[PDB]
Amino acid sequence: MITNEQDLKMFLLSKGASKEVIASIISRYPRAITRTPENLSKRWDLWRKIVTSDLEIVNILERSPESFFRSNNNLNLENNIKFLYSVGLTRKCLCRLLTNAPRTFSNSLDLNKQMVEFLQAAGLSLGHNDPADFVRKIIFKNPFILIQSTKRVKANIEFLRSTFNLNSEELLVLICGPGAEILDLSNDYARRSYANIKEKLFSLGCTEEEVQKFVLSYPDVIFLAEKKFNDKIDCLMEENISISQIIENPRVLDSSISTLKSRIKELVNAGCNLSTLNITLLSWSKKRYEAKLKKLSR
DNA sequence: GGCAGAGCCCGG
DNA sequence: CCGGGCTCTGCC
Secondary structure (H helix, E strand, O other): OOOHHHHHHHHHHOOOOOHHHHHHHHHHOHHHHHOOHHHHHHHHHHHOOOOOOHHHHHHHHHHOOHHHHOOOOHHHHHHHHHHHHHOOOOHHHHHHHHHHOOHHHHOOHHHHHHHHHHHHHHHHOOOOOOOHHHHHHHHHHOHHHHHOOHHHHHHHHHHHHHHOOOOHHHHHHHHHOOOOHHHHOOHHHHHHHHHHHHHHHHOOOOOHHHHHHHHHHOHHHHHOOHHHHHHHHHHHHHOOOOHHHHHHOHHHHHOOHHHHHHHHOOOOOOOOOOOOOOOHHHHOOHHHHHHHHHHOOO
16 A cells, blocks of 8 residues: 555655655654644645745755654644734744744744733833834844743843843843843753852952953853853863953853863963963864964964 | 854954 | 954854
C-alpha cells in the first residue's frame, strides 16, 4: 500500500521541496510523518498567512522542523494569527515570532491576549498616548515575550525600575533595547544575578554608581551564571586587566574563560601594552583579531 | 561564544 | 570626499 512517509514526501514535493531536504527533515523529526495530508495542508496555508512563499516556508522547515511539526493545533494557530494581526502587529513581526518563538502560535490565545493586554497597560503607564508603537517595538525586540507570564514580565520591569532608579522614559529605552531579553528571565534568578555582581564588584572596590552604570551599559551580563561571572572577572585580573578596564569595555565578558586568556598571552606575552589598549578586540572574532595583532606587532 | 555586514567615525 | 578601522548590532 502506501506508508506514513509516502504522504509527507508527496506533500512536501508539491511544495517545492527537494527530495533531499525532504529526507533531511524526515530523519530529524519522526512525528512529522504522523500529521495527515489535511492537517499539513491547513498548517501550511496558515503559515502562508505570514510567510510569503512555499520556498521561505521550506528553508524554515529545514533549519527548524519541530517548528512546524510539533503541534497539530491549527485552530489555536489560526486564532493567534488572527488576533495578533488584529492588534496591529506587522507581517515581519509575525515572521520573526514564527522563526524565533514558534510556540507563541501553539500557545493559548488567552495567554497571548493577556500579555498584549499587559503590554498595552505598560506603554500607557509609561506616558504613552497610543501604546501601539511600544507594543510593536518591544515584541519585535524580544519575540520570546509572548511566551512569558505577565507576572514574570511585570516583576522584572519593577525590578529594573527600582534597582536602577529609572524613570518612565529611562525604563522604556532599557526594555525596548539593551535590557529587553532580561524580561524573559526568572525574576528570582535576575534578583540573585545582580546581587552577586554587586557583591563581587564592590569587593573589588567599586562604588554603587560604578556598578549601576556597569550593569546598565550591558544588562545581558545578568545572564551569566554567578560562578561564571565571578570566575571570569577573577581571570581578567590575574591577566591584570583592571576592573576599570573590565567595566569600560563590558562585552569582553562575552568571551569564554579560556579565550581571552590565551589571547593576551600573545598580546602581552609577545609585546604590547595591556593597560593602554582598548580590549574591545579581546572579545573580537578570530579573523577580526589576528588582523589587529598584525598592525599591533609593529 | 564566534562572527562578520552596516553603518559611523577618524586620518587623510 | 575616500579609505580603513571600529562599534553596534543582530544571525548562526
